[model samples]
Target: EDITSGLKQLDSTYQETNQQVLKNLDEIFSTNEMGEEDALNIKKAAIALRGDLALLKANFEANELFFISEDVIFKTYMSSPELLLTYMKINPLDQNTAEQQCGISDKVLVLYCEGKLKIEQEKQNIRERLETSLKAYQSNIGGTASLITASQTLVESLKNKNFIKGIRKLMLAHNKVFLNYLEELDALERSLEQSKRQYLQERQS
Candidate 1:
């Protein structure tokens, strides 16, 4: 629950960024080609385009890892009887069986377990959020991968002053918008971080 909570926001950001990148790449591809400029100019724009693509790819890779690790954590939490109990309002079994199911019978341990359970149960909403997030993440990853292929093809086929200029211009516009998204995401992350800290502090006291 701790790890998987709020993951939907991260996945949401990833998809938004990828969508913007794909939009820019499409514009770059559609821009008219013209006579080749000097080799240096083409090379410079190609390098910049490559750099932006690599950055986008890097972001995707990192987000992919987060999704992978969170999914594993999700499974671990789902498989635990304690977490299962946390989600249920009423006992699913007899008291003795419930204790056994939780794998503990001590008073202090039970108290601590219940404390953690309450916190975790509050996180149940994230499971629903993750359901839709993962679905979108899976579809977008495959769909945008084709954009990667198209971009790669464009890179190989780059052959004109006008197209190269268009690549630079479109990439700049994309970056400007992408930066705003990054800023908004950062703000959200910061708020979540502070909320987590405050929540834990409150629990501690």
Candidate 2:
């Protein structure tokens, strides 16, 4: 029960930022391209975040299955890497089970994995919101030829069976970016920064 206790502590955040997200989506119905582009912009933002998670995983796997950071001795893993990191000293884990064990116990890994999985799912929903937002936008314009095609293509593509396996593979990874508590905050911040770069690139281009 002690080991399982770590994961039992779960937090819930309501869709609290709906109004701000609405503001960001204000110009959504302005133009078909821009509207679809609005969704594209958000898709791009979410995709960039998806990539950052991949990087976090890659770095962990590369570092001999651990994060070489300010916290080294021992750290409590959490659902998201957005947890705070504190400076400290460090040492080693049992080399016997180290390779397979990686950072923490199986319970820790499993629960955190579950948390990260939810994040990807949440991100997917955000992209879908934009898809339907455009759907509503298209309805307003009386379904012109280009708008209808663009709108339909986006919806179909999101629902496509193999969209994840395409050449671009621009969609979010099926895998979640589970970061331990100490590593959480940094990784989470990187996600935001990375997305802004993508957002900026789109605006500039």
Q: What is the per-residue lDDT of model 2 for residues 1-205, given as tens digits with 9 covering 90 to 100? A: 5322322221001112222322333444242888776777655554443444344334323332222231342244322243311110122234553444344465434334333443444445445543543344333322122222333466644532232222112111111112233245446546544544565587778
What TM-score number comes out for model 2?
Answer: 0.22
In candidate 2, position 198 carries an lDDT of 67
Clashes in each model (backbone N, CA, C under 3 Å)?
Answer: 0, 4
The lowest-lDDT stretch of 10 consecutive residues in candidate 1 is 140-149
lDDT of candidate 1 over 20-87, digit per residue (tens)? 65466555545513444543444455445545545544544554454456445445434344443343
Q: How many clashing pairs in candidate 2? A: 4
- lDDT of model 1 at position 89: 32
Where is model 2 more than 4 Å wrong at Cα? Answer: 1-80, 83-105, 142-205
Model 1 residue 161 distance off true place after TM-score fit, in angstroms: 18
Off-target runs (Cα >4 Å) in candidate 1 are 1-38, 78-81, 84-205
Could you tell me every candidate's TM-score relative to the true structure? 0.29, 0.22
